[PDB]
Amino acid sequence: NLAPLPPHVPEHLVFDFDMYNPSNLSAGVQEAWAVLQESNVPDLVWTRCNGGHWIATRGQLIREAYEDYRHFSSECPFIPRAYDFIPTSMPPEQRQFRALANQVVGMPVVDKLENRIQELACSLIESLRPQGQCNFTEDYAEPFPIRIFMLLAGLPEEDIPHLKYLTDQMTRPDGSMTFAEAKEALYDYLIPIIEQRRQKPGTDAISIVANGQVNGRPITSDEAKRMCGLLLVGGLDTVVNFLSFSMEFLAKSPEHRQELIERPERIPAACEELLRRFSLVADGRILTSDYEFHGVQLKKGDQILLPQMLSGLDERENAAPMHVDFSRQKVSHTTFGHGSHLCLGQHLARREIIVTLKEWLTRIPDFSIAPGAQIQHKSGIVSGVQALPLVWDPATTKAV
Numbered sequence: 247n248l249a250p251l252p253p254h255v256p257e258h259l260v261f262d263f264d265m266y267n268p269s270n271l272s273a274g275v276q277e278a279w280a281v282l283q284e285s286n287v288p289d290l291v292w293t294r295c296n297g298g299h300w301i302a303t304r305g306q307l308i309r310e311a312y313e314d315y316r317h318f319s320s321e322c323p324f325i326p327r328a329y330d331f332i333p334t335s336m337p338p339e340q341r342q343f344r345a346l347a348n349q350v351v352g353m354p355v356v357d358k359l360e361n362r363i364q365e366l367a368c369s370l371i372e373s374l375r376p377q378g379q380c381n382f383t384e385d386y387a388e389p390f391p392i393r394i395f396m397l398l399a400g401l402p403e404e405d406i407p408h409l410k411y412l413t414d415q416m417t418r419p420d421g422s423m424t425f426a427e428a429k430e431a432l433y434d435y436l437i438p439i440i441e442q443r444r445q446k447p448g449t450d451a452i453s454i455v456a457n458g459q460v461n462g463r464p465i466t467s468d469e470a471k472r473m474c475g476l477l478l479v480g481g482l483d484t485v486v487n488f489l490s491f492s493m494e495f496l497a498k499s500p501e502h503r504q505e506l507i508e509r510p511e512r513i514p515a516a517c518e519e520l521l522r523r524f525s526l527v528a529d530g531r532i533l534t535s536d537y538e539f540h541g542v543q544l545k546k547g548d549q550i551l552l553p554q555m556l557s558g559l560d561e562r563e564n565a566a567p568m569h570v571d572f573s574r575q576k577v578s579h580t581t582f583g584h585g586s587h588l589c590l591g592q593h594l595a596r597r598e599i600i601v602t603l604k605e606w607l608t609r610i611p612d613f614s615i616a617p618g619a620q621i622q623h624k625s626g627i628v629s630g631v632q633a634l635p636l637v638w639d640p641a642t643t644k645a646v
């Protein structure tokens with residue numbers, strides 16, 4: 247299961263961390279990853295797991311490597327070594343595609359969409375409220391971002407379960423479809439819509455993308471489908487799992503819950519602190535050349551894991567980093583990434599989070615983990631929560 251150690255890697259830097267099955271997973275996934283920040287662990291280590299790769303363990307190195315795109319390329323952005331979404335793997339071109347994507351998910355769009363997002367959150371919460379229980383992950387978290395995508399992209403509600411099935415197959419295959427088959431089925435769906443909206447545009451994301459320009463010429467169908475596909479999948483598992491870590495914490499910490507109930511104006515700040523504490527993405531890069539990085543010889547072609555999750559957990563970045571404190575004066579994190587690939591959806595995501603917390607806490611202020619339940623986490627490129635059974639007394643809630 248361990249790949250043989252390359253001869254350029256000194257043995258004293260070896261730490262066999264498995265990003266898909268870390269040793270202390272039962273104790274919490276962020277805690278399991280923070281073992282990389284224990285004092286006997288160097289800033290940059292090599293693991294023999296998963297093909298063999300570097301891991302930067304501290305925020306300083308994680309940020310620097312994401313800044314240095316000339317050495318740390320997105321050509322292979324995932325460990326381990328058919329994925330073709332745009333602009334994940336791409337500078338003049340990356341910048342043009344990002345600008346176009348920014349027209350459709352940037353702050354002005356999110357500000358226009360906010361009340362629609364609230365209305366959606368409200369309808370979902372109200373549907374669960376009288377039951378006095380739900381699996382938050384399945385019953386609220388999963389249906390919310392996919393519905394926001396349909397709003398954003400001007401797609402009919404009827405198309406949700408099929409689209410959701412394809413995106414589920416790309417990350418959590420049941421075996422009916424290979425990744426490549428799921429991706430192509432997604433493209434089968436998007437291509438006709440892109441073409442129709444090229445000729446007869448609305449103001450939705452697909453119309454805007456389909457009418458965009460790259461290199462002084464019209465965006466191609468291939469480019470537009472790959473961009474639309476990324477806009478869809480980028481906002482699903484990340485938001486599902488993040489909302490689930492946040493709601494798990496709030497269920498388990500009545501005093502933090504009470505703080506937001508009493509002081510709802512703190513919710514935007516609380517969102518930032520939760521993004522830091524329950525950070526969840528760990529992407530990577532591949533070396534474009536031999537490069538000495540902080541005293542360590544990296545070889546052309548080596549992969550390096552640069553966990554976005556770790557920057558904000560680094561005690562060099564935030565004191566007492568496992569403590570949640572909504573009043574931190576400086577919330578330092580790279581939860582949405584860093585450098586040229588910084589999350590295009592960061593504004594939409596924050597609004598989704600804040601709206602969800604505001605609406606949940608006003609309708610269902612008092613809730614707990616279901617008696618007897620033990621919450622299980624999962625680890626990967628996007629770490630997450632397997633299920634989140636919550637319980638409340640319906641008499642303590644308030645209807646619309």
Ligand code: HEM
Pocket residue numbers: 323332333334335344347351476477478480481482484485488526527529530554580581582583584586587588589590591592594595
């Ligand atoms: C809490 C929720 C989210 C988190 C934690 C998150 C995290 C990230 C991170 C870390 C990256 C950079 C990956 C890298 O550098 O390799 C990224 C990129 C991206 N995200 Fe998000 N994301 C979230 C929500 C969203 C949403 C809601 C959307 C779309 C509506 C979205 C779309 C994208 C896209 C299109 C990129 C690629 C940007 C590029 O390559 O230039 N994300 N995200």
